Symmetry: C3
Subunit: 643 residues, 3 copies
């Protein structure tokens, strides 16, 4: 037949037959009809024929190949489908299409189809791999599998699989689209298209008892609607390599969150964006402290940056340590909404409980939190050592109860932070040995007649920041205001959303935007509602050190000081200074309004300009008197106020 029909492209070519042109390759339909019947025996023969002839690629043309648990133990084989019409279906309940042990296998251009049934994480699966190294899975569609697409496990260190542009649909309850087990290096998930209504995970990894290197790098996926996290990554026995890297992708509609990590040595999450994740809490999980669209638990190294997490139904970013030690950096992230699911004990922007790790919170911002914008430490069992806070913006969280909630910390460093119009207490610290809030810090503008900054049973406190209330300019009719200007009326404050001219309807609303007649005013918070700027409770502080940059002004009192258990030593440098001129041998000097004191126990220094003895005869909360030995004194004296 074909073996007797010679073929020659031109005279200079070899003399071959039309059969030779076909035999250079291996068409699957030389063995399989592709008519939707059970074809496992034919498929197995074609795999074995390629191995026997020394051929790698097996062309899978358009067809329907119903097939059960195919074993391939050879190495170089390429299963090259021509498109989504190259359909490979499971033929039985609770089974799979392929069982892989050969190395350097590659699947391409195929559509795998299941039957929606599964009796194990090793069934209801397109492909089960066991120590199949360097597995390449590219441009393949997994549809209607009871558990997922590929389950790859390893019992000895080797190259992990590469999933490039895999499509996953209709997976069903309790499933993982990609299931990695054991120890591996160089595993990659690139441009995944994951979307379900019932499956738990898109990418799941578990050690399965085996210890050692597990290098996974997920870049640029699309994850939709997974009931547990989109990417689940677990090591139960931490005890070479780095860990997991997540370089981007978009997540939405996830039930618990986008990323969960357990006990991995190193964690690198960069540029990930989520929306409406963690929107279905699970009783028995979400109320046990595990909450957050990022949930990183007991990792040796954590670096999450450039991540934009919007409308989180539960907590935002949660980084927790239990009981190797490396950095916890949370930098350049944004949280837009938190607690949209209205789950109790939930709605926190940043949950950083670092413990032995020295944490770094840098240049983050958060909006729309219902619990704490950032809670730091807060474990009576496991003390967090060092947490330093640089240049964060936790403003405009009117539904939060605390801007920063910090407890059970050894040293808390803060500077350049901006938190306005959030929380009953803007910053609330408890049981912290050493707190430092630099001059660049700004914590103020309450939502409730309470303390801007409160510290309970904290030993060493250095507070140099601006903890005042904003002394807003008042709202007036028929005055020119630019968009961004801030006026106050009654008990509230507002921002202009459009440059214009003031109407006659003075703003009175407590939420949203309302036109005053022409100008649109948006509510931002309350005006000077705080009961005090800096408050102390619990056991007495050993030291409270303030300076010339500390601002406690414009609250309900002139001083903004509320120490109910008084600190054993309260230092305050450069409170006030000036020059006065005596008359009839006396002056009573008025302290500037922003630095009026809580009592008259502050220290005063004074030296005169003439040969007279000057002394401080009285000290009040808002003034002090300087008298001279000359009852007719008219001299000038220079004075200084401090503690």
């Amino acid at each position: 037949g074909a073996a007797s029909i010679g073929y020659k492209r031109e005279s200079g070519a070899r003399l071959r037959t039309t059969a030779d042109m076909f035999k250079d390759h291996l068409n699957l339909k030389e063995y399989c009809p592709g008519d939707g019947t059970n074809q496992t025996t034919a498929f197995n023969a074609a795999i074995a024929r390629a191995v026997s002839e020394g051929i790698s690629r097996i062309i899978v043309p358009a067809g329907h190949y119903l097939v059960t648990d195919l074993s391939v133990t050879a190495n170089g084989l390429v299963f090259e489908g021509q498109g989504e019409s190259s359909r490979i279906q499971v033929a039985s309940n609770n089974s799979r299409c392929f069982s892989l042990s050969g190395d350097r296998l590659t699947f391409r251009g195929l559509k795998f189809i299941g039957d929606g049934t599964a009796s194990a994480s090793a069934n209801g699966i397109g492909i089960l791999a066991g120590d199949a190294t360097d597995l390449l899975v590219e441009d393949v569609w997994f549809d209607s599998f009871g558990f997922g697409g590929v389950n790859a496990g390893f019992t000895t260190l080797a190259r992990g699989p590469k999933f490039i542009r895999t499509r996953h649909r209709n997976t069903g309850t309790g499933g993982a689209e990609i299931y990695l087990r054991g120890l591996y290096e160089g595993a990659d998930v690139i441009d995944i298209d994951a979307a379900t209504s019932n499956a738990d995970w898109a990418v799941f990894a578990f050690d399965e008892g085996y210890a050692g290197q597990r290098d996974l790098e997920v870049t640029r996926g699309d994850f939709s609607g997974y009931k547990r996290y989109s990417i689940g990554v677990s090591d139960e026995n931490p005890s070479r390599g780095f860990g997991v890297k997540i370089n981007g992708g978009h997540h939405k509609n996830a039930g618990l969150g986008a990323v969960k990590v357990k006990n991995y040595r190193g964690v690198l999450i960069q540029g990930v964006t989520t929306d409406n994740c963690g929107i279905v809490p699970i009783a028995g999980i979400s109320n046990t402290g595990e909450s957050g669209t990022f949930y990183i638990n007991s990792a040796g190294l954590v670096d999450i940056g450039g991540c934009k997490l919007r409308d989180n139904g539960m907590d935002g970013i949660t980084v927790i340590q239990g009981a190797a030690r490396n950095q916890y950096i949370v930098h350049d992230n944004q949280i837009d909404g938190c607690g949209t699911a209205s789950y109790a004990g939930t709605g926190t922007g940043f949950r950083i409980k670092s413990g032995v790790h020295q944490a770094f919170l840098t240049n983050n911002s958060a909006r729309g939190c219902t619990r704490f914008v950032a809670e730091l430490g807060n474990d009576p069992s496991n003390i967090s050592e060092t947490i330093t806070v640089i240049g964060n913006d936790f403003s405009q969280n009117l539904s939060a109860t605390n801007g920063i909630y910090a407890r059970y910390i050894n040293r808390l460093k803060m500077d350049m932070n901006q938190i306005e119009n959030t929380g009953a207490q803007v910053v609330y610290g408890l049981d912290i040995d050493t707190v430092y809030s630099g001059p660049g810090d700004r914590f103020g503008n309450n939502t409730v007649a309470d303390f801007h900054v409160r510290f309970d049973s904290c030993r060493d406190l250095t507070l140099l920041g601006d903890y005042s209330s904003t002394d807003y300019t008042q709202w007036v009719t028929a005055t020119a205001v630019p968009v961004g200007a801030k006026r106050w009326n009654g008990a509230n404050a507002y921002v202009a959303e459009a440059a214009g001219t003031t109407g006659a309807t003075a703003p009175t609303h407590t939420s949203g935007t309302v036109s005053d007649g022409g100008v649109n005013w948006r509510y931002i918070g309350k005006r000077r509602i705080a009961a005090a700027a800096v408050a102390l409770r619990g056991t007495a502080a050993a030291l409270v050190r303030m300076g010339g940059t500390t601002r406690t002004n414009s609250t309900s009192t002139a001083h903004g000081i509320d120490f109910s258990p008084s600190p054993t030593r309260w230092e305050w440098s450069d409170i006030d200074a000036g020059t006065a001129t005596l008359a009839a041998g006396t002056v009573t000097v008025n302290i500037t309004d922003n630095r009026r004191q809580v009592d008259g126990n502050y220290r005063v220094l004074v030296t005169g300009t003439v040969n007279e003895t000057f002394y401080v005869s009285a000290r009040a909360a808002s003034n002090f008197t300087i008298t001279s030995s000359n009852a007719a004194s008219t001299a000038t004296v220079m004075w200084k106020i401090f503690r």
Copy 2:
């Protein structure tokens, strides 16, 4: 051929040679590929593949002239074998394909147009309307009057994927990749885009359709586009649903007319690790002189995070982030500008432009060189007030051509620390109409280029200035002295740095630019020595509070004090100015204030207590000295004093 039997071995199926062919669909089974108009035959191949249930259509080497090939089915794979698999448009102002089918893919092809176009859906290789999961990979688009692919969407689905697409010779006003409507997961990976006439490489707009519009660009190559390489626009961003916006991850841009990236109203912008060179080099009248300037131009985005971007030889501005009139962070961090204003356009040449309005902005660990206008201008919109801009650890030094290092205006609160600006601007930092200014102890703004103020503030209410605003007191250039490389010496009005270690020659350096050799050492000009008229100056309406401390440096300018308050502040606090102990003689001492802390007047406060039973008082106070006298006209006591405001 249907009668010629074929069998691999005895255990295989008995098939014909025609059966082996019919498993696939060769396009040349219908199209001759000889350069003639073959739309009818091409359509029959497409229609045959759909009826046979075949996805892949193999497109061998050939020349296929084609016009408006409609495909509505979903499985099809148009698989060319390389660049000789040529598909040409066969009509003016038309296209090769019109797709509505989902999961389509094109591979290994070369599309050729005819340089003509009349609308964005003409002069196009492929038009797509609601064609979901479009993959377009390793295909070359050449000579298309408008562009390569136009993909639009009216309902939310998977956006297109363009992998290693090549674009050449497009044409005036064209866009290589047109994106319309709402979509998720759009990807442009490793694009090879270059023109002499086209306007954009990637252009995306809503066309009235609100919703999620997620586009990601990674590691492209963009050269020559007369507008921006990547332009992206939304008109109803409140309806952006469950999306984020635009992400740009790498790639190199060059020779762009206006810039590399333009964004308008997108809810989220992520630009990371992008490098440009010679971008913004062809200004356009009516655009470039209206405030739209900068090789990155981000206008009214809800969230902006650009980092690790290195922008070289910008013809206009560098990075511009502007707000009009949801409210999220503006982070510009770890970026670099090497040069600006190389086109010599008026009102143009600013390194950083951050007008953030309600957005809380962060400027952290950036650096800029070669700026001509401002190195960074913050706020500066009388209409729209910028709330908070905090500036940590930036390097704006060695911009000898800039008029200001930092020009800030119309901000409510400006927080700065750890910044380093030397040898830039007539005024290093110029603030106007700012309510609260904080400059931490790590801030260093000094070494003018003109006899002017290091740090000037106009009509600013609350000023806290704890940084080093001094002039560097360079040591003088000397002959026959060994200098290490990196050493700084002054001669005349100019300061210099050593390019090599060695021993100075005999001819003192007197140049105001470049590097000239003394007899044995090459000296590079770096700026002017102690030329400043003052370190800290105030103008406009009086400041309510000026607060300095023991770290504030105002020394070594033209004056000993470095203060120039033409409207004096209503309150001036300066703690820890000077202190010491003096021992009296004949009942008096006149103490000299330390050189670096000499004052502008004698209105500072003096405290002093004695060592013995005498009354001690301060009888005189001047700008540079003050006297302490005692009751005992023969006093020899030691007194401890302190100077402050």
Copy 3:
């Protein structure tokens, strides 16, 4: 034969022959038997047939094609292998399989095999390229080549190659898997699989005398075992880099590298992000490692350096090294982590951060380092080239017990520091020498020595401002039968400990200087020494012109009560807000005690005081720990307010 057998899919299709269906493509086996014989003449005839027929793709089925120096000069060709059994082996020693000069060529799905021999960088190679622009090479395996897989050179600016998922094995002595020469734009190495025992580099690039743009981007490779650096990149004329940035490295994992993972010499731009390494720099080389060149990242004299998000574990020699000799853009090192250093015990070596910036303004932000010998971070330290500005923000260098210095700074003009955390590292936590201006903000914490030495020491520095916490931690004592939470810190003897678990104490005090040992009920981990420092702040060398401290400065709880050890005293010493309070006289005088933490080194400090009544008050005496206030009235019972400062 085949040309007379008609084929027709259906009535509506063209009537062709079975030969026409084959003549649409070009099967290589139409000219080559693939039987292991020398087939270069046949392979050349196959390539030439594709060119004259206008076909691009040449299908390479499973087979063994022995081949030598195949020249292809045409442009569109695609060499389309079918898998790893598509084997193209070199036929001669010291030779190559291909020599490319054509543009837009692509190789896909092949396995190239060498014979282990090489006599030059252009031999022992799978593919030599010369001005072969727009080269793509994807999913192809290079094995057993004497020098490497691809050597691509360029003499005029054009688009460099793209190596996508290329596998490299068994390259041998002194080779480089990928060799880029000359000037180019848009070169890419994506997802490389690189592993050898004998090769020097995975990716290497140098100018070869051609100045211009040399843009290279590496993304997400796998590198193991290379005797030099995994990625080596070099230029000798950098000023004329034309319209190009430099080299970008965006991830990948390196391991078992001889010298390091990345080397750069004189590139205008360097961008490294997200790279993780393990056990790199483990085979030092005499004549290199002991000449200053050390570090798994070694960036020498680059014009711009931004490295961030990199995690370097178990470095044999040095961590990140950034050096500049003698355009002038930023040096940013941020958000990086060193986990181990100096594991190879090589001399003069073990430093986590080596930053020699010179004219570049350097930034050290939010980095951490552990397990360092030598110095955790050494800044400047070049008697040649002064480092002009280095500013160090929010770094954590704590718990490097085996290091001699946390920070060793030298030959810097201006050193700015704040928000750093360095506890339990070094004989001196921070040691600065020959620095003109030093600033250490109130958020800095440098304390808890490992030697009876100085927490912070400065030699021959001119302007020093120290506002941070340089105290010894005053640990609470370990006591029997007291509940402790995990993370608590107690002391015993000369050592301090931290708890590994909550519970109640035992009855055997911790006496170990390493690791973890149970006391009976709780396991205590050794973390450092207790109050061992001789002084908090020390000054040597030429006298400082100014030492400025403030109310936030901490020098307490060391060996002495003051923490001061100025051997050449500074010409001016300002210390604001040392202490203050109110005293009440008795029999005319009081002697006020300075608080324990702020006890002074002498009685040369200043005192201010004013009284509450009409009496003349003065300070008749001042001692290191106390001063006396007396009045004119020898029966004074008056209250007086005072303040201590310098």
